[PDB]
């Protein structure tokens, strides 16, 4: 899944 601070 996408990182925490995701883009």
């Amino acid at each position: 899944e996408l990182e925490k601070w995701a883009s």
Partner: antibody
Amino acid sequence: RITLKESGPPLVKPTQTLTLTCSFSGFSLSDFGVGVGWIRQPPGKALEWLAIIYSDDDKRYSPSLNTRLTITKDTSKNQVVLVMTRVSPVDTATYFCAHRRGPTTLFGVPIARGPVNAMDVWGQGITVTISS
Amino acid sequence: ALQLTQSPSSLSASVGDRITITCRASQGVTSALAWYRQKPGSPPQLLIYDASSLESGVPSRFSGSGSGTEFTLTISTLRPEDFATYYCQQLHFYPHTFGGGTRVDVRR
């Protein structure tokens, strides 16, 4: 100045449970968006990401090790603990904990997320050998 | 999961050379990529964060560029302390993958 240091048993036997502690200074796990992660390195091999925990308490784990890892924090003691169950010989490695910056803020307003893209300060690493 | 491939895996060079290490991702990771240098017996040290920002206290001969699926680290004038292993790390998707590393050693 941020510093981190890993501690735990240097030797552990197969099937046992391994508890590693990261004690740090220079930041608080209550600071905005900060993270502390764990990375390991079997001798002669590449770095392998294990898990990370943030100050708002979100936790994430390597999918390959998810079932054997638990990461937790103790904010008031400035420590992050990683518990790995059922270890086997392939878990012998040097284990590092590391700091991850949270976004830069201006008058408490997040304005830059570029600084979160790296683990910026690392502990010296603790060598763990798994053998019966 | 997401794959990060470093090239070359090993590289020989001499003091004063310009080297460039590259890292390619299987899916785009935007600019969430970091480079590290790790000397034998020591922990990895952050050189470049967010694909191209120079980490504070890191010497200017180190440079990082690229975004998406292709990134490069170049050391413009290799110094003796640069004989080491370099790693790239992606932080866009969990898990936060590391590349296989590239060993830089003394050419002969």
